[PDB]
C-alpha cells in the first residue's frame, strides 16, 4: 500500500537521492552481481545496513 | 671456536625461519592488537542498528 507518488526514471552511476518503495537514502546506484533469491527485496551489509 | 659459533648461530637463525613458517600463533601479540581494534570498530558500527 503506497501513496500516490509518481515514479521517475531510474538513474545509475550517479549520486542521487533515492526512494525505493519507501526505502530512502543518498547514494550511487549500480548494477549488482548479487544473487537475490526470488523473495528477497533488499540486502544488507556486514554492518547490517542496506 | 669461531667456526662452531658461526654454525650455531646460522643454525639458530634457520630454526627461527622454520618456527615462523610453522607456528601461526607465534605473532599473537600483534594479531591481538589488530583483533581488539577490529572488535572496537565492529561494535561501534553495530550500535547504529
Amino acid at each position: 500500500v503506497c501513496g500516490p507518488k509518481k515514479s521517475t526514471n531510474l538513474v545509475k552511476n550517479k549520486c542521487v537521492n533515492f526512494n525505493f518503495n519507501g526505502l530512502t537514502g543518498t547514494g550511487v546506484l549500480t548494477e549488482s552481481n548479487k544473487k537475490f533469491l526470488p523473495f528477497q527485496q533488499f540486502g544488507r551489509d556486514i554492518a547490517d545496513t542496506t | 671456536n669461531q667456526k662452531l659459533i658461526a654454525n650455531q648461530f646460522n643454525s639458530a637463525i634457520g630454526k627461527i625461519q622454520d618456527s615462523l613458517s610453522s607456528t601461526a600463533s607465534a605473532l599473537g601479540k600483534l594479531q591481538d592488537v589488530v583483533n581488539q581494534n577490529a572488535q572496537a570498530l565492529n561494535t561501534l558500527v553495530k550500535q547504529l542498528s
Binding site: D45, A47, T49 | Q17, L20, S21, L27, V34, L41, V45
Partner: peptide
C-alpha cells in the same frame, strides 16, 4: 616476509569511519 604474511572496511567506512595511512610505509 614471513612476519608480514602471517599478520569489511567498506561496511565500516560508509558510516564516517575512515582509516588514515601511516606516515612511514612498510617499505
Amino acid at each position: 616476509d614471513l612476519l608480514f604474511n602471517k599478520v569489511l572496511i567498506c561496511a565500516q567506512k560508509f558510516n564516517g569511519l575512515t582509516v588514515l595511512p601511516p606516515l612511514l610505509t612498510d617499505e
